[PDB]
Design a binder for this molecule. Structure first.
Ligand SMILES: Cc1cc2c(cc1C)N(C[C@H](O)[C@H](O)[C@H](O)COP(=O)(O)OP(=O)(O)OC[C@H]1O[C@@H](n3cnc4c(N)ncnc43)[C@H](O)[C@@H]1O)c1[nH]c(=O)[nH]c(=O)c1N2
Ligand SMILES: CN1CCN(CCCN2c3ccccc3Sc3ccc(Cl)cc32)CC1
Length: 371
């Protein structure tokens, strides 16, 4: 085998890195995941994830976890509303499509993947800060923790990874849109009007360059996001301190001044907001060839892209499926060639996904956009 008497280090225990670990481990591969989170009870902020047939779901199938995912996921319909709260479109999930892409909470998905791994596969409180290639092994340097070695390093630590340079000099870029997100607990009580507007479905609305997305039931909480072109005054992210809810409430109430009070109530009752600039890690020219030791990247570390049209985790789970199969099917003469074959495929569907996400972004933020 390519990996017999060798070990693999996966950097990052996100959904992509944990899936990569499971697919390698179940073929007898010595693999560890180093995750910066202090422990597994760390809450993951964000909306739900939906896994697609042919990609995310195919990775779960290969891992024996497809039913586990279905049992914790929820098919959800979609309502499009206007800024006055009129429901313009209602699409519920037809029973024959209930397996197409049901939504799963991110902590639930992490728990599924962790539970499927052998004990002590993930090493918590391990923030990788530097890599160094040796004669045959990488040396991994962690923050204030002892070093580790690995024959193969797989960078899976998300879109802002700083440990990419052995693979590419490409830099993450801001696309020019900005996202504010929040959770409301017990929304049926705390934002009843907007909760009733959703009516069990996800909701999307667009008006004059401001977009609102909401999921009224991410394991009982309501998750929502407000997205817009990054204001020109923010060449230093000025005016809005996201540590100060009053500053954020004031900014959003002005942007949403002509929206229905059900939306304004949502802004008014939120206890804290998270701001996030939209970024892309653009796939263009090939990555570096003839690297000193085998190394590659998967998931957002490889092809972070805007999330507004549903691109994201599924292309990362496709990475893990392809790369793990190449490392274990015994068709390749070296780890480098298995990696090369993975990267060549990923550049094709990754570039397509990026082009679509970037085009979609352009369209959804034109001042007169409607869904
Ligand atoms: C607002 C918004 C909304 C959406 C989405 C994004 C955003 C910003 N996405 C995108 C999607 O969530 C994204 O593709 C995945 O989280 C990618 O998972 P990864 O495992 O690659 O990275 P992810 O960022 O999830 O995981 C990286 C892991 O590495 C760890 N880490 C970081 N640095 C480290 C270090 N130095 N050492 C060790 N560990 C380190 C982190 O703690 C984390 O656990 C999405 N996608 C989708 O498919 N459907 C959707 O609906 C959405 N919606
Ligand atoms: C099925 N999938 C579900 C959702 N995909 C869109 C993800 C958009 N995204 C979001 C975008 C920008 C800022 C914040 C957010 S937060 C959010 C919250 C709720 C919902 Cl439904 C969607 C989002 C697409 C397809």
């Amino acid at each position: 085998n390519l990996l017999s008497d060798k070990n693999v280090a996966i950097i990052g225990g996100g959904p992509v890195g944990l899936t990569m670990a499971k697919l390698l481990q179940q073929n007898g591969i010595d693999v560890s995941v180093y995750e910066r989170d202090n422990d597994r009870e760390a809450r993951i902020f964000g909306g739900t994830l939906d896994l697609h047939k042919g990609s995310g779901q195919e990775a779960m199938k290969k891992a024996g976890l497809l039913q586990t995912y279905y049992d914790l996921a929820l098919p959800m319909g979609v309502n499009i509303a206007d800024e006055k709260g009129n429901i313009l479109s209602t699409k519920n999930v037809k029973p024959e499509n209930r397996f197409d892409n049901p939504e799963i909470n991110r902590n639930d998905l992490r728990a599924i993947l962790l539970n499927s791994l052998e004990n002590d596969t993930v090493i918590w409180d391990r923030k990788l800060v530097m890599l160094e290639p040796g004669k045959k092994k990488w040396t991994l340097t962690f923050e204030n923790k002892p070093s580790e070695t690995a024959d193969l390093v797989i960078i899976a630590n998300g879109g802002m990874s700083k440990v990419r340079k052995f693979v590419t000099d490409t830099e993450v870029e801001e696309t020019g849109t900005f996202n504010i997100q929040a959770d409301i607990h017990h929304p049926e009580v705390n934002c009843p009007g907007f909760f009733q507007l959703c009516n069990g479905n996800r909701l999307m609305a667009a008006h004059q360059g401001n977009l609102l997305f909401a999921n009224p039931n991410n394991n009982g909480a309501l998750h929502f996001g407000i997205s817009f072109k990054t204001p020109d005054e923010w060449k230093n992210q000025t005016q809005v301190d996201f540590q100060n809810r009053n500053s954020v409430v004031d900014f959003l109430l002005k942007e949403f001044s002509d929206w229905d009070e059900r939306y304004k109530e949502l802004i008014r009752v939120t206890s804290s907001f998270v701001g996030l600039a939209t970024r892309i890690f653009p796939l263009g020219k090939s990555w570096k060839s003839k690297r000193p030791l085998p190394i590659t990247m998967i998931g957002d570390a490889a092809h972070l892209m805007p999330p507004f049209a549903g691109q994201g985790v599924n292309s990362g789970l496709m990475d893990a499926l392809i790369l793990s199969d190449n490392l274990t099917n015994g068709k390749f003469n070296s780890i480098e060639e298995a990696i090369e074959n993975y990267e060549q495929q990923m550049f094709i569907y990754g570039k397509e996904a990026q082009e679509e996400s970037t085009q979609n972004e352009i369209e959804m933020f034109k001042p007169d956009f409607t869904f």
